[PDB]
């Protein structure tokens, strides 16, 4: 009635103390179990060709996982796991490494972090501690290499995309791989998987040995979305805001693909950091690119930025339509400039400390009628503030029409549409009307 198998640690959690093991033990038996189980299950389905995520999560009712204590360290016990994850009775290494990546970031980091009874005085409300914590997580994930030239390109894109956009992202990935650049994404399908599949080919063509494909996700996502099978360095941050800060501090360049309206929220976030005068001398290339069909999509998005943040916004990004070689060539040229930029201030090559991220951008935000109310949506205040309050505005009603939390108050309380300048509020509907005219 039950088939069992023991997995030894690989890639992480391979050198533990007995106290740490005992800590992991109770954590695996506290309320965190449901989260820990659903994440392990998602990892074990990376590569299973059932596109419907939640469909497959139910197919495995038998599955359960427990943590085994051994004098030396820990082992993972799997009860009735998916068959497609094994080869002649042995677990596929890639999955095995992701399997213990969950053990690390969910139980060791996530479960012991909220515990302030367990960890030292860690003021989660202090902006500095957050940044250093993000660093500690990445270091614990063995994702920060010493004295390595900048070659990491973060990529953001839509969850599900048409076959047309997918090919362009693959092509861009290939051109990035052909130039010995590595890739970091949201660890999912769609635009978060295509650039990796393409970069793998280029690396092979260039005989590039150690590809780094970093999937950076969070518990609520990975619990329902298995990671794409290209990810070879999995990382799960505790909060949404900590995941986004991780993206910014490890990246040496950022490429944004069409992601529907979410692209706007993602774009405003970056501008809120770059257009901060404290970051005037920072060097972080930003390219927004897409197939020939996404011409007007980015046009609409560009007019919005100009008409609200000013032409000054364009000195921080470049739009490239249907040219993969140019996108990759731009990023390759910027790497020495990043290296030179970090070297000019003494910053680390693998992690951007000096980049000032305002504390408002590191804290969670809830789309209630109160928080939204005091959104300063006029152009009189600093540009970097307007962009911050604009991000918190989009995602506010993003999940506010059909999301289980938005319509619980959108038809019981109605739309809020917080006070702002009559001109700015229209340039948005022009943006929303524009995305609708293209079936986004
Ligand atoms: N900013 C930075 N430097 C790093 C990093 N990892 C290694 N380094 C190296 O540390 C060295 C810099 O130390 P120093 O030689 O004393 O130069 P400093 O004037 O003191 O710079 P600083 O005061 O820190 O701002 C350089 O090596 P070399 O120049 O001697 O050789 P190579 O050219 O091959 O890289 C850097 O390449 C890193 O993550 N960030």
UniProtKB/Swiss-Prot annotation:
| Keywords, sorted A to Z | Hydrolase
What is the top EC class of this enzyme, as a single word? Answer: hydrolase
Reactions this protein catalyses: a pyrimidine ribonucleoside 5'-phosphate + H2O = a pyrimidine nucleobase + D-ribose 5-phosphate; AMP + H2O = adenine + D-ribose 5-phosphate; GMP + H2O = guanine + D-ribose 5-phosphate; CMP + H2O = cytosine + D-ribose 5-phosphate
Q: What function does this protein fulfil? A: Catalyzes the hydrolysis of the N-glycosidic bond of diverse pyrimidine and purine nucleotide 5'-monophosphates, to form ribose 5-phosphate and the corresponding free base. Can use AMP, GMP, IMP, CMP, dTMP and UMP as substrates. Cannot catalyze the reverse reactions. Is required for optimal growth in glucose minimal medium, possibly because it contributes to nucleoside pool homeostasis by degrading excess nucleotides and feeding back the ribose moiety to catabolism.
UniProt cross-references to NCBIfam families, sorted A to Z: Nsidase_PpnN
Family membership? Belongs to the LOG family.
Instruction: Indicate what this protein is called per its UniProt record.
Output: Pyrimidine/purine nucleotide 5'-monophosphate nucleosidase
Task: Please name the source species.
Answer: Escherichia coli (strain K12)
The taxonomic lineage of its organism, from the top, reads: Bacteria, Pseudomonadati, Pseudomonadota, Gammaproteobacteria, Enterobacterales
Q: Which gene specifies this protein's sequence? A: ppnN
């Amino acid at each position: 009635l039950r088939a069992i198998t023991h997995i030894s640690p690989l890639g992480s959690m391979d050198m533990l103390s007995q106290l740490e093991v005992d800590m992991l033990k109770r954590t695996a038996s506290s309320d965190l179990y449901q989260l820990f189980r659903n994440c392990s299950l998602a990892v074990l389905n990376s590569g299973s060709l059932t596109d419907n995520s939640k469909e497959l999560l139910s197919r495995f009712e038998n599955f359960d996982i427990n943590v085994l204590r051994r004098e030396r360290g820990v082992k993972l016990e799997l009860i009735n796991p998916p068959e497609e994850a094994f080869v002649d009775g042995r677990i596929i290494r890639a999955l095995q490494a992701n399997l213990f990546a969950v053990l690390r970031d969910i139980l060791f980091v996530y479960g012991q972090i909220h515990n302030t009874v367990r960890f030292p005085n860690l003021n989660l409300d202090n902006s500095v501690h957050i940044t250093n914590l993000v660093f500690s997580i990445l270091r614990n994930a063995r994702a920060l290499h010493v004295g390595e030239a900048p070659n990491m390109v973060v990529c953001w894109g839509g969850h599900s995309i048409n076959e047309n956009e997918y090919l362009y992202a693959r092509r861009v990935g290939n051109q990035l791989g052909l130039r010995e650049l590595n890739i970091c994404t949201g660890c999912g399908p769609g635009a978060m998987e295509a650039p990796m599949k393409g970069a793998a080919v280029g690396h092979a063509q260039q005989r590039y040995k150690d590809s780094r494909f970093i999937g950076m996700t969070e518990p609520s996502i990975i619990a329902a979305e298995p990671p794409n099978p290209l990810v070879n360095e999995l990382i799960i941050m505790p909060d949404i805001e900590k995941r986004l800060e991780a993206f910014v501090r490890i990246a040496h360049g950022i490429i944004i693909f069409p992601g529907g309206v979410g692209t706007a929220e993602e774009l405003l976030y970056l501008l809120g950091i770059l257009m901060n005068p404290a970051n005037k001398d920072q060097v972080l290339p930003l390219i927004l690119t897409g197939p020939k069909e996404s011409a007007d999509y980015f046009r609409v998005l560009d007019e919005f930025v100009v008409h609200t943040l000013g032409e000054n916004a364009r000195r921080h990004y470049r739009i490239i339509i249907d040219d993969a070689a140019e996108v990759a060539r731009q990023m390759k040229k910027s790497m020495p400039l990043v290296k030179e930029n970090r070297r000019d201030t003494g910053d680390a090559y693998s992690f951007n400390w000096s980049m000032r991220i305002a504390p408002d951008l590191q804290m969670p935000f809830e789309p209630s009628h109160e928080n939204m109310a005091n959104l300063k949506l006029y152009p009189d205040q600093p540009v970097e503030v307007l962009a911050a309050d604009l991000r918190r505005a989009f995602s506010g009603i993003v999940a506010g029409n059909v999301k289980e939390v938005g319509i619980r108050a959108i038809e019981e309380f109605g739309p809020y549409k917080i006070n702002g300048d009559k001109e700015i509020m229209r340039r948005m509907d022009d943006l929303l009307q524009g995305f609708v005219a293209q079936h986004r």
